[PDB]
Amino acid sequence: SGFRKMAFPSGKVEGCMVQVTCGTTTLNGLWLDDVVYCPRHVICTSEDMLNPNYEDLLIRKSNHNFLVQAGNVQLRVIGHSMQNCVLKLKVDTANPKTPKYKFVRIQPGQTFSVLACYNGSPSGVYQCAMRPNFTIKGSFLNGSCGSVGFNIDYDCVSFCYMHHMELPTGVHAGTDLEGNFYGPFVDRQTAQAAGTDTTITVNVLAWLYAAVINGDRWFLNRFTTTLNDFNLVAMKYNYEPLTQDHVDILGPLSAQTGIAVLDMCASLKELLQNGMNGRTILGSALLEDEFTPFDVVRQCSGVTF
Amino acid sequence: SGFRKMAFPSGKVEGCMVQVTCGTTTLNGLWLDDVVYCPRHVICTSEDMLNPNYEDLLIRKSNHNFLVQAGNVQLRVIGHSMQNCVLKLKVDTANPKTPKYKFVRIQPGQTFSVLACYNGSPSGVYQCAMRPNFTIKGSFLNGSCGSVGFNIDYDCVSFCYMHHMELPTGVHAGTDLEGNFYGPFVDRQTAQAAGTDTTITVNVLAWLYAAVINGDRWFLNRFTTTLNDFNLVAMKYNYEPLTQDHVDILGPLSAQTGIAVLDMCASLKELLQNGMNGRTILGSALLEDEFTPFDVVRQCSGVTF
Ligand SMILES: *C(=S)NCc1cccnc1
Ligand SMILES: *C(=S)NCc1cccnc1
Ligand code: NA
Ligand code: NA
Ligand code: NA
Ligand code: NA
Ligand code: NA
Ligand code: NA
Ligand code: NA
Ligand code: NA
The missing domain is CATH 2.40.10.10 (Trypsin-like serine proteases)
Structure with a gap:
């Protein structure tokens, strides 16, 4: 727990x-x-x-x-x-510590760990998401460039991110490991617009499933909704529109908890319209969007590397 | 940033x-x-x-x-x-990977990293605090026992925590590396009372300094207070009483920001009495107490290991 x-x-x-x-x-x-x-x-x-x-x-x-x-x-x-x-x-030397690894270009909404480094030494590690608008909300000082983001699947390291810059607004932009920026950013010190950011709806839902699993259940209500009706509320609150692919990825969490996806959506709706009333869910007074459905299952079932 | x-x-x-x-x-x-x-x-x-x-x-x-x-x-x-x-x-074998290490018994309010493990393999890493009441709010399933908590100072690992149990209330208890529990807990499956928990006041203040450093400054006000007056408000909100030792540990953050400790205290007071009005500080809608003054300086100045 x-x-x-x-x-x-x-x-x-x-x-x-x-x-x-x-x-x-x-x-x-x-x-x-x-x-x-x-x-x-x-x-x-x-x-x-x-x-x-x-x-x-x-x-x-x-x-x-x-x-x-x-x-x-x-x-x-x-x-x-x-x-x-x-x-x-x-x-002229092969790194003797090279893990099995590949390079992957992740999708907005997906998560990864960052090992923040200075002078080629590790300072710390934290989990974060690629925002819908292709920024990340990191913790990065001068000298942190080249810090990488990654996932691990048993013994295989998937490198997805290399850090390159801080925008004038205090958020972070960077590349995949072939050097293609995520998003519209370039590697010059100039005014650069990040889009409007959205909340990652499917991640929020996964986290509500995590809460129910852990015994935080106050937010569950006697309502249901539809995709289209939920999407109208997602609009207004700047949430990413929810699609059937998202519903389908949530299926194993739905099945474990017995709580249909669209009912969880009706719970979320009510949170979005009424706020949280000074309550917390899983220690948070905001809706958290930096857990994927994969992340919640991994954590709730105790997968090792 | x-x-x-x-x-x-x-x-x-x-x-x-x-x-x-x-x-x-x-x-x-x-x-x-x-x-x-x-x-x-x-x-x-x-x-x-x-x-x-x-x-x-x-x-x-x-x-x-x-x-x-x-x-x-x-x-x-x-x-x-x-x-x-x-x-x-x-x-009969010395671990060839043994780091320099010591065993330390930390104080309530201090922080450390946990490497959550199953079957002797690492699943993940997260930072947390020893609560005033000597519990920790971890993420731990059956099989996670023996997972350890630690700090690192360059090449020296300080082991402070070994995980032993989940209380019926869903929080976690364990030992130092000489096997002495933190707190009143025993290693039997019985009803066990954790005390009233308190918020770690000095950590909250450190985090408010971190916010100012990062440009989140809305909460700063035109008021000051005294230790005794602040302590009366700490009381009512179940915050740990603040002492001169705490003021003194906050000194380097006070000096970097130009904001006297007791003025930061008056800001906190006003947050405690008025809540946050649906605003956030450093992405949080709660007052965060799991950064020490040491943690904030380390992060804000980019210390490596
Ligand atoms: C990296 S070596 N320089 C750019 C930078 C500075 C601050 C935060 N992130 C990137
Ligand atoms: C550990 S091997 N068993 C006790 C336990 C179970 C769940 C969470 N923390 C400790
Ligand atoms: Na992010
Ligand atoms: Na980017
Ligand atoms: Na570059
Ligand atoms: Na740059
Ligand atoms: Na804790
Ligand atoms: Na304990
Ligand atoms: Na034991
Ligand atoms: Na036990």
Whole structure:
């Protein structure tokens, strides 16, 4: 019992973090096999970051200008390429701690753990979601760039996120591990609009199932609704529209609890229209949208890595 | 920018977790040097757990009845002793992954990371506090016993908590690593009263400093108060009384922000008396008490391990 925002155990990723320096910029990189991945903005000075010409800046650079360090272990860089907004530094040693891993581009609403790092060392680990508008609400200071987000499935690490920037509004943007930003962001210091954010409706519902499982049940009511009627209320409260695919993903939670999805929707409706009346659910006075249905099942059934 | 509930990176602890089986009970143990530590209730059957005579149960046991496994690696048990509510299994191999570590008994209000484990494998990591009443509000299923709580200071792991039980009320109790429970709890399945819990006032204040640092400043007001006047309001809202030691620990945050402790206290007062008016602070609609002043400084200044 209890329900917590829980990160994956981070040890498989801790052994892949390195420090990358170029000129006087230092940030973090990820060492997998004989390739180090890092944000291409490692090659930018202070000048350059309002309007960087990344092709031209990188031409000024040679393999020996990339100082890559793992612990005290210096690595030797024998190749460099830029893919989209990441740099790939070929080194002469395969990381002996490389886990089984793949690179995945996640969908808005999906969750992952972030290992926040400075100077190639881990400071902490936390779980968060890719917002509908492709930002993340992290905790990241100068020097945290190249910190990665990941999921773990037994022994397989799925890397989904590399951190690149803080927007003027205090939220965070970054790339997948092929260097394609999530969202409309670019790697320059400019005004950039994040969309309107929405609440992740399907995640909220999963979390209400988690609450019932744990004995928090006050919000359950004698009402039902329809998809279309629920969607009209989702509208007004800036919630993502709910689809049958979402209903279907909620099925195993529906079956465990005996509470039909559309009845849970009617509960949510009533919370959205009436607020929470100064009550809490699972220790929160807000509706929480950073657990997926997969997350709730994993936690409520005690899956290991 | 951003402020998150962040756990320590868990890799140093992941390499110490094992599985311990005795009869048909399996839980988790912690392998450090040539000693495995685990909850003594591993030797209990279903019968025994209403009223266990631990001395007599353990006498029925020999070294070879303790099956200790690390990965597929079986360990050989060459000695067993019970200290308070933990069992110490002497094994014939020193853990090659043993970090620098000590055992510490933390104070109510202090925080630590928990690596929740099943069958000696890590499922996840989360930060929490030792409540004033010596419980913790974890996320723990059957099989999670022996999961540990810890802090990290560079390369030194401080183990402070081993999980032993869930109370009938759904909160969690356990021991330090010498097997002394925190609080009045015992390791039997019985009605057990946790005290009245209090909010950790000094942690709330630290978190208000964190909010100001991050730009959430709406709650700041044109009032001040005194310790005694603040303490009268702490009373009524079941907040821990605030002492000069608490003021003094808040000093570096006071100095960074320019906001005198007692003025921050007057802000808190006004929040306690008026509630939050449907506003949020650092994404929360409640006052958060699971960051220490040390935690806020660490996060806001980007300390690594
Ligand atoms: C990273 S090394 N620099 C950009 C940055 C700064 C603050 C937060 N996130 C990204
Ligand atoms: C641990 S192996 N058994 C007791 C328990 C059960 C549920 C939660 N926490 C502790
Ligand atoms: Na970049
Ligand atoms: Na987020
Ligand atoms: Na992004
Ligand atoms: Na940038
Ligand atoms: Na015990
Ligand atoms: Na707690
Ligand atoms: Na306890
Ligand atoms: Na017990």
